[PDB]
């Protein structure tokens, strides 16, 4: 009949209405996004006199507690980052309104998927990819602060927003599926395209799962297509193996879900389970990037900063990000000191 005196819908979301005024403060403009958490609306704040993005959580206990964990992480980050210089989206405040938790964020521009979409998935240049790579590594360095130890756990182009359309500044949004380092409670985390091997293999994991995601994300920004576009976990692992080969034996011996993907032959080596795919490590990243053939699709031939020497700096950095072992996979601090950012 009527849910929350007619304010909500069957799905517990607030029925957003153009031009509604909340608390004599926020003038609601339009719906900009929707998620399982609920909705995101564009609004004008008449006290601060600026546009804001409001995340209106569903009126239900499961999402209210989830959103509360995000609110805890953002208010903890805002405490450390006062100067607003570590590339995380700023939570201005939060309030309860008609039985909905509302989060007030700074208004940013489109996401990195939208930029890829406007190219018809042909990608952006390497100069712009470097600027996104530099800011993202700085952001992961901030999350690796020992008192934070925050894992975003769902890094992808949609969850990276541009501050301003005419600038290269980006901020990471959406810490709803994020957590601080600790004992393993969850194994089904990260979006499949961006999911680390340790998660695919069902193994212990830490903040290095974000660095794997970042490696996948940076190649997609320049090529325009997902590096590993698995339709299922078995497809995801096979496409990872296509590029990087079979994970080391000492990892697959410890992986619980190792036999979901590989067979252990009588001699001790691990082989792919028969199901198509190129043999392991033959779809070279060297050839995917087109280090010697003028970039992806030859569409970067003759462009500045797109030489073979420049592509090898990017290839090396990306390979260090896609290290199978999370203990030896490159960390934000060392990645920033790479020759690619020189
Ligand atoms: C379009 O101007 C903005 C500015 C700041 C933010 S913060 C955010 C967000 C927060 N939490 C989860 C998600 N994820 C979704 C909707 O899928 C997005 N969106 C925006 C949009």
Pocket perturbation via mutation, ligand 1, pick of 51, 105, 157, 163 by most ligand atoms within 8 A of CB = 105
264 is in an annotated binding site: no
- Measured over the CA atoms of residue 19, residue 22, residue 25 and residue 31, the dihedral's sign is negative
Specify the residue with its C-alpha closest to ligand 1, atom 13.
174
55 is in an annotated binding site: yes
**Tokens standing for 93?**
């405040």
Chain breaks in the chain (C to N over 2.5 A) after: 275
Note the resolution in Å, 1 decimal: 3.2
- Please calculate the CA angle 53-118-314 and round it to the nearest 5 degrees: 95
- Measured over the CA atoms of residue 81, residue 31, residue 63 and residue 96, the dihedral's sign is positive
All domains of the chain in start order, with CATH:
1-81+89-107 (3.30.200.20), 82-88+108-342 (1.10.510.10)
Ligand 1 close to Cβ of residue 301 (< 6 A): no
| Residue 314 burial by Cβ neighbours in a 10 Å radius (0-12, 13-18, 19+) | buried
* Ligand 1 centre distance from Cα of residue 40 (Å): 6
Ligand 1 close to Cβ of residue 57 (< 6 A): no
* Ligand 1 centre distance from Cα of residue 209 (Å): 22
Paired strand residues for 51: 44
Please indicate whether residue 154 is annotated as part of the active site.
yes
Ligand 1 close to Cβ of residue 206 (< 6 A): no
Looking up tokens 């209405």 gives: 17
**Tokens standing for 193?**
């395209």
Paired strand residues for 179: 151
* Ligand 1 centre distance from Cα of residue 25 (Å): 20
Method used for this model?
X-ray
For residue 45, which phi and psi values (nearest 5 degrees)?
Answer: -95, 115
Indicate which residue of 8, 13, 154, 174 is catalytic: 154
For residue 176, which phi and psi values (nearest 5 degrees)?
Answer: -70, -30
* Ligand 1 centre distance from Cα of residue 108 (Å): 8
Q: How many whole angstroms separate alpha carbon 144 and alpha carbon 331?
A: 9
Which of 50, 52, 11 is CA-nearest to residue 34? Answer: 11
**With contact defined as beta carbons under 8 Å apart, do 317 and 334 qualify?**
no
**Tokens standing for 151?**
């894992």
Cα–Cα distance list, 18 to 36, 44, 71 (Å): 21, 12, 26
**With contact defined as beta carbons under 8 Å apart, do 154 and 174 qualify?**
yes
Q: How many whole angstroms separate alpha carbon 312 and alpha carbon 202?
A: 32
Containing H/E element for 235? helix 233-244
Q: How many whole angstroms separate alpha carbon 314 and alpha carbon 338?
A: 9
How are beta strands 50-57 and 38-45 bridged, if at all? antiparallel
Task: Report residue 331 CA to chain centroid gap.
Answer: 16
Which of 124, 292, 309 is CA-nearest to residue 217? Answer: 124
136 is in an annotated binding site: no
Ligand 1 close to Cβ of residue 33 (< 6 A): yes
**Tokens standing for 73?**
């992480």
What does the radius of gyration of the chain's CA atoms come to, in whole angstroms?
22
Ligand 1 close to Cβ of residue 105 (< 6 A): yes
168 is in an annotated binding site: no
Ligand 1 close to Cβ of residue 36 (< 6 A): no
Ligand 1 close to Cβ of residue 40 (< 6 A): yes
58 is in an annotated binding site: no
**Tokens standing for 187?**
């194994």
Question: Rounded to a whole number, what is the distance in angstroms from the first to the last CA of the chain?
Answer: 62
Question: Which atom in ligand 1 lies closest to the alpha carbon of residue 110?
Answer: 1
């Amino acid at each position: 009949k009527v849910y929350n005196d007619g304010y909500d819908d069957d799905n517990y979301d607030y029925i957003v209405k153009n031009g509604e005024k909340w608390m004599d403060r926020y003038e609601i403009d339009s719906l900009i996004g929707k998620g399982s958490f609920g909705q995101v609306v564009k609004a004008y704040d008449r006290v601060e006199q600026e546009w804001v993005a409001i995340k209106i959580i569903k009126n239900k206990k499961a999402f209210l507690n989830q959103a509360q964990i995000e609110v805890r992480l953002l208010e903890l980050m805002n405490k450390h980052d006062t100067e607003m210089k570590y590339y995380i989206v700023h939570l201005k405040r939060h309030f309860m309104f008609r039985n909905h938790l509302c989060l007030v964020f700074e208004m940013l521009s489109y996401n990195l998927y939208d930029l890829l979409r406007n190219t018809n998935f042909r990608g952006v240049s390497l100069n712009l990819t470097r600027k996104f790579a530099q800011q993202m590594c700085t952001a992961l360095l901030f999350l690796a602060t020992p008192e934070l130890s925050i894992i975003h756990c769902d890094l992808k182009p949609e969850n990276i927003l541009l501050c301003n359309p005419k600038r290269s500044a980006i901020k990471i949004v959406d810490f709803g599926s994020s957590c601080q380092l600790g004992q393993r409670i969850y194994q089904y985390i990260q979006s499949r395209f961006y999911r680390s091997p340790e998660v695919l293999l069902g193994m212990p994991y830490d903040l290095a799962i974000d660095m794997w995601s970042l490696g996948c994300i940076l190649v997609e920004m320049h090529t325009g297509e997902p590096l590993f576009s698995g339709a299922n976990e078995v497809d995801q692992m096979n496409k990872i193996v296509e590029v990087l080969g079979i994970p080391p034996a000492h990892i697959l011996d410890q992986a619980p879900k190792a036999r979901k993907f590989f067979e252990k032959l009588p001699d001790g080596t691990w082989n792919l389970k028969k199901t198509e795919y190129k043999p392991p490590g033959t779809r070279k990243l060297h050839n995917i990037l087109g280090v010697e053939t003028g970039g992806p699709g030859g569409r970067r031939a003759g462009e500045s900063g797109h030489t073979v020497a420049d592509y090898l700096k990017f290839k090396d950095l990306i390979l260090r990000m896609l290290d199978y072992d999370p203990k030896t996979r490159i960390q934000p601090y060392y990645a920033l000191q790479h020759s690619f950012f020189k």
